[PDB]
Amino acid sequence: VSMTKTSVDCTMYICGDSTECSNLLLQYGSFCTQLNRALTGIAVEQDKN
Amino acid sequence: VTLADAGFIKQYGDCLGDIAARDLICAQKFNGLTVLPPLLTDEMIAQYT
Amino acid sequence: QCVNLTTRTQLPPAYTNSFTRGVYYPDKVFRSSVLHSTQDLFLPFFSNVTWFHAIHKRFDNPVLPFNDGVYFASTEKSNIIRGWIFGTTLDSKTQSLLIVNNATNVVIKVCEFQFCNDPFLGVYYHKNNKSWMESEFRVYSSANNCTFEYVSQPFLMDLEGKQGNFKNLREFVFKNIDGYFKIYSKHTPINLVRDLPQGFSALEPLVDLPIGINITRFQTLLALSSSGWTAGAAAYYVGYLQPRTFLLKYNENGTITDAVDCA
Amino acid sequence: LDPLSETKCTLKSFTVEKGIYQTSNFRVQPTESIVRFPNITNLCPFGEVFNATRFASVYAWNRKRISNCVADYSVLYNSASFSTFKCYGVSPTKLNDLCFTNVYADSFVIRGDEVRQIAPGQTGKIADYNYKLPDDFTGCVIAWNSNNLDSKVGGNYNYLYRLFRKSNLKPFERDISTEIYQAGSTPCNGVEGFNCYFPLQSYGFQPTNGVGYQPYRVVVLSFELLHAPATVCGPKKSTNLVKNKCVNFNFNGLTGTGVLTESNKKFLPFQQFGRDIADTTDAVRDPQTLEILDITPCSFGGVSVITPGTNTSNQVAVLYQGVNCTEVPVAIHADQLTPTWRVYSTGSNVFQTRAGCLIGAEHVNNSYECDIPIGAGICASYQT
Amino acid sequence: LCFTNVYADSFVIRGDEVRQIAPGQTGKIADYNYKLPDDFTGCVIAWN
Amino acid sequence: VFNATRFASVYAWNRKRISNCVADYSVLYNSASFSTFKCYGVSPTKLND
Amino acid sequence: AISSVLNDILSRLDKVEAEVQIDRLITGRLQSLQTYVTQQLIRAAEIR
Amino acid sequence: AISSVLNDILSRLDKVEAEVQIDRLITGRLQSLQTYVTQQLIRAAEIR
Ligand SMILES: *[C@@H]1O[C@H](CO)[C@@H](O[C@@H]2O[C@H](CO)[C@@H](O)[C@H](O)[C@H]2NC(C)=O)[C@H](O)[C@H]1NC(C)=O
Ligand SMILES: *[C@@H]1O[C@H](CO)[C@@H](O[C@@H]2O[C@H](CO)[C@@H](O)[C@H](O)[C@H]2NC(C)=O)[C@H](O)[C@H]1NC(C)=O
Ligand SMILES: *[C@@H]1O[C@H](CO)[C@@H](O)[C@H](O)[C@H]1NC(C)=O
Ligand SMILES: *[C@@H]1O[C@H](CO)[C@@H](O)[C@H](O)[C@H]1NC(C)=O
Ligand SMILES: *[C@@H]1O[C@H](CO)[C@@H](O)[C@H](O)[C@H]1NC(C)=O
Ligand SMILES: *[C@@H]1O[C@H](CO)[C@@H](O)[C@H](O)[C@H]1NC(C)=O
Ligand SMILES: *[C@@H]1O[C@H](CO)[C@@H](O)[C@H](O)[C@H]1NC(C)=O
Ligand SMILES: *[C@@H]1O[C@H](CO)[C@@H](O)[C@H](O)[C@H]1NC(C)=O
Ligand SMILES: *[C@@H]1O[C@H](CO)[C@@H](O)[C@H](O)[C@H]1NC(C)=O
Ligand SMILES: *[C@@H]1O[C@H](CO)[C@@H](O)[C@H](O)[C@H]1NC(C)=O
Ligand SMILES: *[C@@H]1O[C@H](CO)[C@@H](O)[C@H](O)[C@H]1NC(C)=O
Ligand SMILES: *[C@@H]1O[C@H](CO)[C@@H](O)[C@H](O)[C@H]1NC(C)=O
């Protein structure tokens, strides 16, 4: 009926505790937000199901 | 059915230290990989049932 | 001195089985409660280890190849297995390494050594003093050009014993990698008569020697008028490492407790 | 400014509709830096390595082991006497912030056309026949004109290269061979013969030679980093060690951010670092006092903002998810956390939920229909 | 191409140190004399 | 080239152009007929490959 | 990249040699999330 | 890359220059399989 809800902090996965990596991740624009939107879409719908 | 986490109040009390090591989830949490709780507890599912 | 001790019996080349031995810590990292996958020069499981003896009659000290590294183990009593020679010519045309545990200290050295055809060490057995003492060193005639030399702080290690079965197993891994001779080792108590014990136990690293030399062959050194003698009954086994992937099960506290050879 | 202004930003809208919104994970920041290095007092032998009276021949290159010493690479770096100083697995500035397990100086002399062949993955009779560096060489190549030290007017033929070899030599291999190269199909025994060559040839190094034909002294520093117990280190003083506080640690060059803690992990005497399933360090043996330290990343979690929309009110409640009300108040703005906002640290309604910690919402015993879903049986709503 | 604001920075150095005029460098000219911004837009021109 | 019945004087050195052909020196470097063959940018073995 | 550990690039290399290595790790890890979220979006349709 | 044939790279370039061209082909090829397997995982749901 459901699966485990997950949420992934896209900056902390890629660039964990690093400011330099964080300033470089900004060069890929919305990609991390798109990932968190998609996981929030899945995770809200496990409570719908 | 034997689960690996469900967002059951992680509090670095058992994670930080001996239990950061042997735990898929402690490595999950520390890297932005979080598991969220369902909206309905296993008691509320049982009341509807 | 330098002498050939030719009084021995001719026997064919023996072998036995490396069941689950020759596994060592592949790095200087702590791990626990984990099954870790690594590719390195390990002893292939259940390989033919080539088998050697000292008896009464037999004093098996052949000059053996050393290719991609070596596993060496001795089931031992009365401290018979005392060291090893390594090199590619052994006749002072090129350098060679000596590792020796004498009666008092360990010596480790690299030289253009001129080795004997039969290298060994010898002990005066119960000669009116009730104790036993080392007296003969006959391994090389000279050691002119040398480039690495170490001697341990002094001790006395005993050279006596006549119990039937073996009470000690001693295991060593020798890898000569990129100018470094790496030694890994284990000791365990046993109660076995004539074969390599079935079981598992991993070898901790113990010394890393920066020796820099080519090694292509090796030979072990045994304790013993010039000809006619009694050897102590002790037995040793030799295997060759290969690039094999291993899965390593670390327990709770933090030590290898089982392994799987992926090939 | 405030958690609502983070959601307005996160969504790129000045109006936020009713809901529970995901926001930046909070993370408690380091109170201070720690530095810890093995205490060695003698400075490494740079005057022996870079200033010997004679160097080796390239065919028989010397290798000196540098160990149990402090390395001040600022002396080598800042000195103008060097024409080449290139590093291949470190930037040259970082050499002083860092430690090395075993370090070596490969010392020899070559022509100024050949310095290019000393770089890893190269070809020509130096890279091919007498000094090959590995594909992953970690270290620095250091080179300078020594015409005034080495060269004599008729030719310093003491410096020898190898012109012939059966095969390209392996990385860091040295070859003392003087055995005769067979260029014809014939075998060739003894000292000499027709189309038989002595494999070595000498440089006619003279001061009247053009630049490039002069003797360049080379040192190649080789070293390996961060993988085993250090024995050579840069000119950094250790700080005191602190525990149970979040800090920017650095042990042997193992820079990081974490809470340090006394560990019960029984490291065997050869071990120094402990690695997690994720291939990051999670324990360290302190190099001055040989106790094991657990390393934990400083406390962090999801933040989510629960709002009743912008059209109604601006008031919001904040869920620190998977976090107990304790780690909240620990998150005091005194220790720098990501969120520049700390206004909610007031509480007096800091409800604890299975889902986490809820700040800014009152906990009413009465049970209503779920409005904004918080998780684990809890919901929130905006009411009188 | 066209340029919004333009500045010629004019000075004399030793010929070795022309390299230290590359962006992202270090050494006594690049350290405390004439440091470039790491994302420098421009051209460096030198002659004996 | 190598077997001509008369060579030029050095003050009037010849210049024979060569094309549309294969350079097998196996009757050449492999023969002791020359008291000096030296190449200066290639190994004499590599001329075939 | 030279290492899997982000701090062993940033404590070894500078501001301009690191950027080459850090960006291989940003590219590889970002593609690791885009793989996981694709798997999980397809998965969520099997559960739906 | 300078070619689609993996051996034409290895025949014409040294280790560090071939590793650049080969990593293009690996990055490309791998992105071909991750596209194919995504199409097949979606198409397997149409068939399921
Ligand atoms: C031990 O015996 C070997 C031969 O079995 C001796 O080796 C010979 O040494 C001489 C020079 O002294 C050489 O001319 C022979 O060619 C060698 N023979 C072999 C088969 O190698 C060796 O010298 C003897 N050593 C001692 C100490 O007597
Ligand atoms: C949040 O942490 C506190 C500790 O700070 C927990 O309180 C402990 O609870 C146990 C079990 O009832 C008691 O035996 C301890 O004495 C308590 N310690 C203190 C100092 O309060 C609390 O249970 C935790 N809450 C959750 C939801 O995990
Ligand atoms: C080991 O030795 C025996 C002879 O005693 C031989 O038949 C066998 O094939 C060998 N085993 C392996 C695995 O090489
Ligand atoms: C042990 O051997 C070494 C050389 O191998 C020698 O220097 C030393 O004197 C010996 N010790 C004894 C007690 O014989
Ligand atoms: C007995 O021991 C002494 C030294 O303790 C030694 O000098 C002597 O030679 C020994 N006697 C015999 C017969 O070995
Ligand atoms: C080794 O011995 C030979 C023969 O005497 C000598 O020519 C050479 O210089 C020696 N090498 C060293 C390093 O002493
Ligand atoms: C050691 O010497 C032997 C004999 O010359 C040779 O075949 C072997 O390749 C050498 N080993 C190394 C690592 O060069
Ligand atoms: C693990 O710890 C237990 C209890 O302290 C002990 O009995 C056992 O010997 C330990 N194992 C190892 C491999 O150290
Ligand atoms: C070598 O020694 C001289 C002193 O004789 C000193 O002036 C020079 O700077 C030293 N060179 C290096 C590279 O340290
Ligand atoms: C570091 O120095 C202290 C004294 O300053 C000493 O206790 C300690 O032994 C030293 N470190 C090591 C590894 O010996
Ligand atoms: C809120 O929005 C509604 C329309 O949705 C409007 O009728 C009302 O006047 C607004 N109130 C305020 C305080 O903005
Ligand atoms: C919730 O109910 C308990 C009795 O179970 C009562 O003591 C407490 O005061 C109530 N809380 C509120 C906020 O009314």
Coordinates of C-alpha atoms in Angstrom, one line a residue, chain G:
Chain G
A1 CA 38.7 12.4 -9.4
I2 CA 41.9 11.9 -7.4
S3 CA 39.9 10.8 -4.3
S4 CA 36.3 10.0 -3.1
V5 CA 36.8 12.2 0.0
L6 CA 35.9 15.8 -0.7
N7 CA 38.1 17.2 2.1
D8 CA 41.1 15.2 0.6
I9 CA 40.7 17.2 -2.6
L10 CA 40.2 20.6 -0.8
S11 CA 43.1 20.0 1.7
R12 CA 45.4 18.8 -1.1
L13 CA 44.7 21.1 -4.0
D14 CA 44.1 24.8 -4.2
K15 CA 41.2 26.9 -5.6
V16 CA 41.9 26.2 -9.4
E17 CA 43.3 22.6 -9.4
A18 CA 40.5 21.4 -7.0
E19 CA 37.7 22.8 -9.2
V20 CA 38.5 20.2 -11.9
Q21 CA 38.3 17.3 -9.4
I22 CA 35.3 18.6 -7.3
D23 CA 33.3 19.0 -10.5
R24 CA 33.8 15.3 -11.5
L25 CA 32.4 14.4 -8.0
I26 CA 29.5 16.9 -8.4
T27 CA 28.8 15.3 -11.8
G28 CA 29.1 11.7 -10.6
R29 CA 27.0 12.3 -7.3
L30 CA 24.4 14.4 -9.1
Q31 CA 23.9 11.6 -11.6
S32 CA 23.7 9.1 -8.6
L33 CA 20.7 11.1 -7.2
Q34 CA 19.1 11.4 -10.7
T35 CA 19.3 7.6 -11.0
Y36 CA 17.9 7.0 -7.5
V37 CA 15.0 9.5 -8.0
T38 CA 14.2 7.9 -11.4
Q39 CA 14.2 4.4 -9.8
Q40 CA 12.0 5.8 -6.9
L41 CA 9.5 7.6 -9.3
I42 CA 9.1 4.5 -11.3
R43 CA 8.9 2.4 -8.1
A44 CA 6.2 4.7 -6.6
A45 CA 4.1 3.9 -9.7
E46 CA 4.3 0.2 -8.9
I47 CA 3.0 1.0 -5.4
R48 CA 0.4 3.4 -6.6

